[PDB]
Design a protein around this ligand. Structure first.
Ligand SMILES: CC(=O)N[C@@H]1[C@@H](O)[C@H](O[C@@H]2O[C@H](CO)[C@H](O)[C@H](O)[C@H]2O)[C@@H](CO)O[C@H]1O
Ligand SMILES: CC(=O)N[C@@H]1[C@@H](O)[C@H](O)[C@@H](CO)O[C@@H]1O
Ligand SMILES: CC(=O)N[C@@H]1[C@@H](O)[C@H](O)[C@@H](CO)O[C@@H]1O
Lengths: 165, 165
């Protein structure tokens, strides 16, 4: 069975393994070369202002030249996406489902996704009848018990609001 | 059909989606909370010196306190792993298959994985018959045609050295 990419339901490979053009995980030219879908593609996938605003898979950094990678060349000066070394303000959604903290910065972990989380992958953002009709952000679904999220547990049976199925 | 984690062959979810304890992708407590395997877990997965050297899935940063996340609290001062803001030296392989450039820094993209790449997910490293019996680094497989890599095309039929078949 396929492992990754279009053929694999959009899954990513573990440990920066390249997803080949055929939807399998590995390293070397056959996986990381022409048609590489994600992982440590070589060259790096195109991104940002060089890819219609598409972000890098696997949280790679998008360089000023619009290539995906890691290192100062990618995450440092001129970085236009991913875990750039520069702080990312929000208040305006964060990219890639990153949490907008109470202080208006993008990140993951409890300081961003916990108490005061404004948007993105918040830990426990309340919604629906339990929250007096509060709406979820990011077009997330409001689950039956009144938490914002995505996936079957939130968009499935009992989904109160958002893009229920 | 499982999507991710130990049920899904170690696959990751795209765009920081959490892999639930049951092997499905999504956001909210059911996915990111207790049992979260990868993605934007809340709290972050344990990592670094606090977790037997385990790295963060999805290239999250490992904080000083050994939790996975993003933002300066995770990638900045005290960062133990992932795309820390500090340059990452190598010469001591790079974690998670990052390329060790000719200059001894970890990253991905042609500057690291291309010409002069020492180890990790190098673009093209020769091995086996076609390279005077040269062995691959990182315990990669040597393909039939004499290129280093992982996956079916390299570890499968024709494999010369490394963890073949
Ligand atoms: C370059 C490419 O995609 N090659 C694929 C092979 O990967 C694939 O074999 C699969 O390999 C994956 C790991 O890469 C895993 O070992 C699977 O079990 C295996 O099937 C092969 C399948 O026919 O197609 C090649 O084109
Ligand atoms: C949780 C949070 O939002 N913290 C941010 C921090 O990540 C960022 O580096 C800083 C920049 O001034 O602003 C806040 O402290
Ligand atoms: C490809 C490579 O190794 N480049 C490194 C760069 O990442 C690092 O920031 C710099 C520090 O002086 O040294 C080199 O330029």
């Amino acid at each position: 069975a396929y492992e990754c990419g279009k053929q694999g339901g959009g899954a990513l490979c573990p440990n920066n393994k390249c997803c080949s053009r055929y939807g399998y995980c590995g390293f070397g030219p056959a996986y990381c070369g022409t048609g590489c879908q994600s992982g440590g593609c070589c060259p790096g996938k195109r991104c940002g202002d060089q890819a219609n605003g598409e972000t890098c898979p696997n949280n790679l950094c998008c360089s000023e030249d619009g290539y995906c990678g890691f290192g100062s060349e990618y995450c440092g000066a001129g970085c236009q996406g991913g875990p750039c070394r520069a702080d990312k303000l929000c208040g305006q959604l964060c990219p890639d489902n990153l949490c907008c903290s109470q202080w208006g910065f993008c990140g993951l972990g409890v300081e961003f996704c916990g108490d005061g989380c404004q948007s993105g992958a918040c830990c426990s953002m309340r919604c629906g009848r339990q929250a007096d009709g509060a709406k979820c952000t990011n077009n997330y679904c409001c689950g039956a018990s009144g938490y914002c999220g995505l996936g079957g547990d939130y968009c499935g049976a009992g989904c109160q609001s958002g893009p229920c199925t």
